[PDB]
Amino acid sequence: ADVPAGVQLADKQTLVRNNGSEVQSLDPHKIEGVPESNVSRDLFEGLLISDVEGHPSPGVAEKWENKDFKVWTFHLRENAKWSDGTPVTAHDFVYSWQRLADPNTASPYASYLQYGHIANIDDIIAGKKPATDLGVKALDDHTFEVTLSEPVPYFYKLLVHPSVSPVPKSAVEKFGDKWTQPANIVTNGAYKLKNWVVNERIVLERNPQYWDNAKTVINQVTYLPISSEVTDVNRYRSGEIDMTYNNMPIELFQKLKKEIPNEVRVDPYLCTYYYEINNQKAPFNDVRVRTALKLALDRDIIVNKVKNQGDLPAYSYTPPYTDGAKLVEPEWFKWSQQKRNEEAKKLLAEAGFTADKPLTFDLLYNTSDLHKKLAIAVASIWKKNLGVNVNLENQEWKTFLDTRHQGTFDVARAGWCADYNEPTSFLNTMLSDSSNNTAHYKSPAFDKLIADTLKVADDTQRSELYAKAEQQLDKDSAIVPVYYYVNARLVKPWVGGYTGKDPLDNIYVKNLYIIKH
């Protein structure tokens, strides 16, 4: 943390953050979500990290070079250490990226290595080559070299993500799935795991072996798994929570804005809220049905009437303010809702649905006040506007993500937040073979457009192909865009160091501090 001159620090430097749900895991290769990543940044540090405003910055690597954007060489700081006092080396990264690529690990982020185009990754994911053929090597203990199959000018931006953090081989090998328990875990971030009570709390304590430990101010942070946004706000206002999770409740937000304006942080956020359609399950494999659901949803009502938290109505998957996004707003978004409703009803009748035989399906969401209230409003709107019947189902976060990967659903509430600020951080998740494709969308034309983005050496041509890829997704109605999120949360006045400037919201508790109050 960088404490400003004259700030008086509190005697006790402890922090309580709500984290939205129980984490899937603490293993960097087994996670895919925001809650998971929130805890992961405090425990495991990759090559680069985000600074307090979100800029890619030195992590374990203190400096790096690239040759033609294809060979990237990272110089690891000599004092980087794990919490057991042993050095973090380039060998740790070689093992870790291999474990990520290895199909036996079944990481949800195995494709992150395809997004960066690390040599031989396609064959490794397919089982054609062993994970040891991955295009990474330790040139010495403090030098990690990555070789890509084509120039990727933004490659380094990918490296602040948890999937490319190191994991301790000896703990993984000796303890297997229990390597993340407090007694067994080894970590190289600013914190160490002290306690993990499932569905109660995760408690982290400062790691004295962290290379930049002298700048760490918070001594202990607790992450809570509260999925009720109303409850989160309640325990923040009671004094227990210092920073809520950034999912705000419809019940109280209007009131909070007027009651505690200075505590309500509302900043840009590169995330899109949408209804994910299972594209491989009839009748959702018919474009007419998917298009009807997309058009009959009234975003103005959801965004401005039912939620009204500053969100913008969405017409694409990639947020239009992503660095590199130059998207074409489709004609259907400019129409009136009445015109969208007629078009929707017309495609539905063409797909064989009648009043006698209506379209009935499930709408899966993860437990939450926000998601439930939004799903109830969406069910009503689709019933009223299009004649479809929806059966709402809630699941806890970890189960919900597994259900979407399994494909055991019809429509699911969904939200993707950028991992790096560039349109492919969204677009690559819709590739046919992406480990993150929970839409189960497979379009050879979409795949080709993205493939072509690294075959040109022009950002103008790249941006045009990204727009065309969004247009292909849209013409196929792969998803139902709802709104672009804003990052809205409550932060006590005494919590210093949270700028709200990073649109990826990659917060590190090592950057924060408690002002005397």
Task: Compute the least distance from the CB of residue 287 to U ion, in Å.
Answer: 19
Quick note: the x/- pattern for U ion over 139-158, rule CB under 5 A, is: --------------x-----
| Site membership for U ion, residue 229 (CB under 5 A) | no
Planar angle of CA 45, 48, 51, nearest 5 degrees: 95
To which H or E segment does residue 222 belong? strand 220-224
- Interface residue with U ion among 62, 84, 323, 447 (CB under 5 A) is 323
Residue 28, token pair as written in the block = 């960097």
Q: CA–CA separation, 63 vs 75, rounded Å? A: 5
Closest listed residue to residue 423, CA positions, set 446, 453, 448: 453
**Three-state secondary-structure class, residue 206:** strand
Q: For the packed helices 459-475 and 444-452, what is the interaxial angle rounded to 10 degrees?
A: 170
68 is a contact residue toward U ion (CB under 5 A): no
| Minimal distance, residue 57 CB to U ion, in Å | 15
Q: How far is the CB of 173 from U ion (least distance, A)?
A: 40
Sheet with 61-67, strands from edge to edge, namely 61-67, 71-76, 143-147, 136-140
Residue of the chain from 410, 474, 502, 505 that contacts U ion (CB under 5 A): 410
Closer CB to U ion, residue 334 or residue 517?
517
Buried-exposed string 443-468: b where 16+ CB fall within 10 A, e elsewhere: beebbebbeebbeeeeeeebbbbbbb
Residue number closest to U ion, CB atom: 11
- Of 37-45, 402-410, 444-452, 483-491, which part binds U ion (CB under 5 A)? 402-410
Stretch touching U ion by CB under 5 A, among 194-202, 234-242, 367-375, 444-452: 367-375
Binds U ion by CB under 5 A, chosen from 5, 6, 11, 214: 11
Size of the site for U ion (CB under 5 A): 6
Of 121 and 363, nearer to U ion (C-beta) is 363
Q: How far is CA 247 from the centre of its chain?
A: 14
Among the listed ranges 23-31, 97-105, 357-365, 463-471, the one in contact with U ion (CB under 5 A) is 357-365
362 lines the binding site for U ion (CB under 5 A): yes
Q: Shortest approach of U ion to residue 499 CB, angstroms? A: 18
Quick one: CA torsion of 298, 304, 309, 314, rounded to 10 degrees?
40
60 vs 467, which CB is nearer to U ion? 467
- Specify burial of residue 385 (Cβ count, 10 A radius: 0-12, 13-18, 19+): buried
Measured CA to CA, the distance from residue 457 to residue 451 in angstroms comes to 13
- How far is 282 from 295, CA to CA, in rounded Å? 19
Q: Is 62 buried (19+), middle (13-18) or exposed (0-12) by CB count in 10 A?
A: middle
Q: Which is nearer to U ion, 117 or 340 (CB)?
A: 117
Pairing mode, strands 389-395 and 360-366: parallel
User: Of 369, 470, 502, 505, which lies in the binding site for U ion, with binding defined by CB under 5 A?
Assistant: 369
At its nearest, how many Å lie between U ion and the CB of residue 243?
18
Minimum distance of U ion from residue 381's CB (angstroms):
19
Least distance from U ion to the Cβ atom of residue 368, Å: 10
**In the complex, minimum distance from the CB of residue 394 to U ion, in angstroms, rounded to a whole number:** 12
As measured in angstroms, the least distance from the Cβ of 48 to U ion is: 15
- The 101-140 site mask, x for binding U ion (CB under 5 A), equals ----------------------------------------
- Contacting residues toward U ion, per CB under 5 A: 11, 153, 323, 362, 369, 410
